[PDB]
């Protein structure tokens, strides 16, 4: 049959168009601007109280409260300014792999190897935190989840699909099926109209929340993609993979822009996050260290060291004032 | 200094006390990870326990001679195992079920899975308890079938004992890390107490070794 050859010639046409639409490189344009000064951050706070490996963290939208998830079966709400514990939620299943914090501040969410996303109400008249909803429609482990408008949540799982839910009914409003391997992460766009997902097929995809369709596919990585994050503008995103490189893609050129790698580092990337202005790019590594890259010149502008095990999760506040890192050594650190 | 911050700090300290208590309670369970190649006898092994909302991971709890066991089965996961296998880095032991009755190159698949698990980078110093199941069907088949179908280099006699010993040695020779981890083999019996006794003895051995390592004597 001719369907496979039709797909092949379509791929050739697409890549030829992408080659045509390329004029210069980001390095050639950027080689005249001032290289940012060498960055030196310090450990301002150390949040301790988890007894097992930390797997995820997420900042509140007020840039003071943050939630963290650990496989000792616990979900902890931290006050970063004073290192006080606000809430400690026990979980039914201890094999948690992701957590989210609602933009309003009223709910939290978590999921894992139970294939169920649990949603907890933080503000009840009884004075305690109670589980309010359990979303169960996935056939694989939950790997990420993000709130949209306090009533809609997007989830990705290891069964190669993504889903958009309705919390009060508990039913999958939409299902996104374009990947061939496990989906490892997703990030929401600032306008919450689009989102991007990375999978173990070494590809990234751009989905439209409305119409439930896939608009664009980006390739270039050599192994599984473990992390993804939008540029603050909303026109580009960055990905980290197991082949020890980060990459920047642009939504409008449908093409890779730059590759962040160094021959002295060979381990994979667990998390990635942009700075407030998009000038810095922070990435967590298996070699127990975090690297701060210049997002425009591709030079390693700094190093965050101090964790005694793999850095699993990373976050930046909405006002750009601090960075939170969580690691398998069961400690969270605030850097400034 | 503090006006209502004192009450918040007191709340934090009570939360800390509760966390320490729950951690101490949880740390006294013995965790086992149960593995196999497509229903090799896992159902029978779980049935030998003495003492649905989820479809991702199954948890079985039992208690033998004052010792508490939690056993995790991840058969119904069927995802990429290398994305979640590191969640079990610090389990006490791995139960591995292998069916002796096989029949299209299924023993080969069991050996391949055992090779992948035993040599995993997350499971060094972790001991394997290897259960061999369905010895009676193996009796009958070896009576009316030669072992050369699976292993062509077999030379020994075509009775049961040499065949079983050869299979056990073929599995046990897949252990590259012979100087760190130990393998405890057992042919499943029909007596209820003996399987649990074997598991209990192996777990006590592993506990003693871990205590010796922690004290700095190993």
């Amino acid at each position, epitope marked *: 049959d001719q369907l496979r050859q039709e797909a092949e010639q379509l791929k050739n046409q697409i890549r030829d168009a992408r080659k045509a639409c390329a004029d210069a490189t980001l390095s050639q344009i950027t080689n005249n601007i001032d290289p940012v000064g060498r960055i030196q951050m310090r450990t301002r706070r150390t949040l301790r109280g988890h007894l097992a490996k930390i797997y995820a963290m997420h900042w509140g939208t007020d840039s003071r409260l943050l939630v963290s998830a650990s496989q000792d079966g616990k979900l902890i709400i931290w006050d970063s300014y004073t290192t006080n514990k606000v809430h400690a939620i026990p979980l039914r299943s201890s094999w948690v792999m992701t957590c989210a914090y609602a933009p309003s501040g009223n709910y939290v969410a978590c999921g894992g190897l139970d294939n169920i996303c649990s949603i907890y109400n933080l503000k009840t008249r009884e004075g305690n935190v109670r589980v309010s909803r359990e979303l169960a429609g996935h056939t694989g482990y939950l790997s990420c989840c993000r709130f949209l408008d306090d009533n809609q949540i997007v989830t990705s799982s290891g069964d190669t699909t993504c889903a958009l839910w309705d919390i009060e009914t508990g039913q999958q409003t939409t299902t996104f099926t374009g990947h061939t391997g496990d989906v490892m992460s997703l990030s929401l766009a600032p306008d919450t109209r689009l989102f991007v997902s990375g999978a173990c097929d070494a590809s990234a995809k751009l989905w439209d929340v409305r119409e439930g369709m896939c608009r664009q596919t980006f390739t270039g990585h050599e192994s599984d993609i473990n992390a993804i994050c939008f540029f603050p503008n909303g026109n580009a995103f960055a990905t980290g993979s197991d082949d020890a490189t980060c990459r920047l893609f642009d939504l409008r050129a449908d093409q890779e822009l730059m590759t962040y790698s160094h021959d002295n580092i060979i381990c994979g990337i667990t998390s990635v996050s942009f700075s407030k202005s998009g000038r810095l790019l922070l990435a967590g590594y298996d070699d127990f260290n975090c690297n701060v890259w210049d997002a425009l010149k591709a030079d390693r502008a700094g190093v965050l060291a101090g964790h005694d095990n793999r850095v699993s999760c990373l976050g930046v506040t909405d006002d750009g004032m601090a960075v939170a890192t969580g690691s398998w050594d069961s400690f969270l650190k605030i850097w400034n | 200094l503090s006006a209502e911050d004192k009450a918040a700090v*007191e709340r934090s300290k009570m939360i800390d006390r509760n966390l320490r208590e729950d951690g101490e309670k949880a740390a006294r369970e013995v965790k086992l990870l149960l593995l196999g190649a497509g229903e090799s006898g896992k159902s029978t092994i779980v049935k030998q326990m003495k003492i649905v909302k989820t479809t991702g991971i199954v948890e079985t709890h039992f208690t033998f001679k004052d010792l508490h066991f939690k056993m995790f089965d991840v058969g119904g996961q069927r995802s990429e195992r290398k994305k979640w296998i590191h969640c079990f880095e610090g389990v006490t032991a791995i139960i591995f079920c292998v069916a002796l009755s096989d029949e299209m190159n299924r023993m080969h698949e069991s050996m391949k899975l055992f090779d992948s698990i035993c040599n995993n980078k997350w499971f060094t110093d972790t001991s394997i308890i290897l259960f061999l199941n369905k010895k009676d069907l193996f009796e009958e088949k070896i009576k009316k079938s030669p072992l050369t179908i699976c292993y062509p280099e077999y030379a020994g006699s075509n009775t049961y004992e040499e065949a079983a010993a050869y299979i056990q040695c073929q599995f046990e020779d897949l252990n590259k890390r012979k100087d760190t981890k130990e393998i405890y083999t057992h042919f499943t019996c029909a007596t209820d107490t003996k399987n649990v006794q074997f598991v209990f003895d192996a777990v006590t051995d592993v506990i003693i070794k871990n205590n010796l390592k922690d004290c700095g004597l190993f």
Partner: single-chain antibody
Amino acid sequence: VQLVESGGGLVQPGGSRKLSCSASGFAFSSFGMHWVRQAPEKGLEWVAYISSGSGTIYYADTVKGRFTISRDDPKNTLFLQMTSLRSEDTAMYYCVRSIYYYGSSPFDFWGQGTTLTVSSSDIVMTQATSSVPVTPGESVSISCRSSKSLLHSNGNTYLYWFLQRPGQSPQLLIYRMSNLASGVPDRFSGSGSGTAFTLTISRLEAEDVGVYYCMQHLEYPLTFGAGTKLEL
């Protein structure tokens, strides 16, 4: 959420009496508790406080020694034992719950209170006006004044506003001087600075009439200040 008090009545002076407060419908062990008394035709007076976990206890100077507060968590029962009953201890007693963490609203639910009748404070809050006739649909502004500055080094201003309708318990309206309570219409608002504060009501309805109290939560004793009646 229910708090029900019991144990009041007529007591000969010099005796001892025990009041109890039973809670049902919330996590009792996670809340600190207060006893607050109101004298007949007078304002509100803070009496005693016990924290969550029973690790901190505070008494007013006028009840120190002869009053003792305690709680029993399994039965969800707070209680107060009183000895040497003087003549100033004739009042209606209220059981109040309060929880303290970042962003919480203390003093949010008040009990019903029990009447005790016996036969025979570095911060001052000065709520100047006694009574103000009002009309529905009018904007009203109550004011409160404090001797010390209520601003703290951490940016908070610890002022609270309570409304008591005729014949009922007080209820919280505004906490920390600008935070509207839960279940309170946006008609009420609060503002101020340092030592001078105001509560503003845009439109007024028949169920807004009552006595308004300001309260400070900055320091060791909690002081209210006499209320401002708001009639029509």
